[PDB]
Amino acid sequence: SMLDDAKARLRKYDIGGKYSHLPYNKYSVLLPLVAKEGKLHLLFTVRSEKLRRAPGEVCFPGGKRDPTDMDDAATALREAQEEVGLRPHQVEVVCCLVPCLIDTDTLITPFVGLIDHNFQAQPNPAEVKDVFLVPLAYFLHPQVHDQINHIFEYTNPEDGVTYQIKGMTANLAVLVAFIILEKKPT
Ligand SMILES: CCOc1ccccc1N1CCNCC1
Numbered sequence: 431s432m433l434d435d436a437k438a439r440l441r442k443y444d445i446g447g448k449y450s451h452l453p454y455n456k457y458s459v460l461l462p463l464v465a466k467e468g469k470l471h472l473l474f475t476v477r478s479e480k481l482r483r484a485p486g487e488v489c490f491p492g493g494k495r496d497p498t499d500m501d502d503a504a505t506a507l508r509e510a511q512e513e514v515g516l517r518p519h520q521v522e523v524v525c526c527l528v529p530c531l532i533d534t535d536t537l538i539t540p541f542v543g544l545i546d547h548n549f550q551a552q553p554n555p556a557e558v559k560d561v562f563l564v565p566l567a568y569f570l571h572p573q574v575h576d577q578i579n580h581i582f583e584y585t586n587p588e589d590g591v592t593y594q595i596k597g598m599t600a601n602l603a604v605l606v607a608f609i610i611l612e613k614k615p616t
Contacts (some may be wrong), residue, residue, distance in 0.1 A: 432465065432468070432470070432574060433465060433544065434451075434462065434466075435609045436470065436524075436544070436610050437524050437544065438492055439609050439610050440524050440525045440542050440609060441524065441525055443525065443528075443609055444524075444525035444526055444527075444530060445526055445527070445529075446526060447501075449529050449537070449539070450501070450539065451489070454535060454536055454537035455497065455535055455537070455538070456486075456494070456495040456502065456507070456534040456536075456538065457492060457493060457494050457503035457505070457507075457537075457538045457539070458492055458493070458495065458502045458503070458506040458538070458539045458541065459489075459490040459491065459492030459506060459538060459539075459540045459541070459602070459615045460490060460491045460492055460506040460507065460509070460510045460521075460540075460541055460543050461490055461527075461540055461542045461543065461602060461603075461606055462490070462491065462516070462543050462545050463542060463543065463545060463566070463606075464545045464549075464563060465519050465547065466563070466609050469565055469566070469567070470563050470565055470566040470610065471547065471563040471565050471566060471570075472556070472563070472566060472606065473490075473491075473514075473551070473561065473562075473563055474487070474488050474489070474490065474560075474562055474564065474593070474599070475489055475490070475491055475514065475553075475556065475557075475560070475561055476488055476512060476558065476559045476560035476561075476562070476593070476594070477489055477557070477559065478556060478557050478558055478559050479559065480532075480556070481557070485505070485525070487599075487601050488593055488594060488595045488596075488599060489521060489604070490508040490540075490599060491509055491513050491514060491516070492510075492538075493504070493505070493506075493509040496508075500563065501524075502526070502539045502541070503523050503541050503551050504527070505545075506523075506539075506541045507521065508525070510542065511544075511553055511560050512554060512557065513553075513554055513557045514551045514552060514553060514554070514558065514561055514597075515551065515552035515554070516545070516549060520545060520546040520549045521543040521544070521545055521546070522542050522543060522547075523541050523542075524542050524543065524544055525541070525542050526539060526540070526541055526607070527540045527541075527542065527605065527606075528540075528596050530599075530601075530602075530611070535557070538598070540602055542606060543612075544596065545605060562586060562591075562593060564584050564593075564603075564604055565593075566606065566607050566610060566611065567607065567611060568607075569582075569606075569607035570607055570608075570611060571602050571605045572584075572604075577596075580596070580600070580602075581594055581595070582594070582595045582596065582600050583595075583598045
């Protein structure tokens with residue numbers, strides 16, 4: 431099936447816990463895969479304008495590890511619950527992709543999660559200004575705009591609203607699209 435095929439692809443890139451004990455400032459992100467209308471989509475957040483780190487930006491759910499978290503996956507799931515109401519029975523964590531090194535002292539670990547068909551996002555306004563889906567295939571032929579560095583623009587056909595996606599967020603989206611959609615019969 432579509433979903434079994436995605437998970438089987440994703441598992442070949444799982445690095446597991448290999449880089450998780452290293453002495454960094456530690457953050458985790460959740461890459462949430464949603465199946466609608468026979469196709470896969472990624473779920474994104476728009477960060478609240480009130481926050482210290484990165485106000486108004488498009489990012490995946492995630493944040494800083496804390497002492498309650500049993501491991502890096504737990505951080506990602508805690509933070510997704512707090513931001514959009516995603517509960518643990520509603521997500522299957524399939525793998526851990528290559529981590530992102532930043533600022534010489536920080537390591538960000540991404541997890542890919544398959545989201546239950548009855549989940550419906552409840553944006554928490556203290557953290558998140560908006561929540562939106564993008565079809566995974568978009569990231570193979572994106573609408574690119576140079577600021578010199580590359581920015582993606584996605585317009586939702588439901589309502590005509592445009593979103594800008596950039597940096598590590600855009601990089602991870604492309605990676606997941608390649609892993610899952612490369613070399614497929616039609
Ligand atoms: C989840 C941890 O996020 C960070 C941690 C450190 C620096 C930048 C970011 N982001 C993440 C993606 N959106 C921009 C800001």
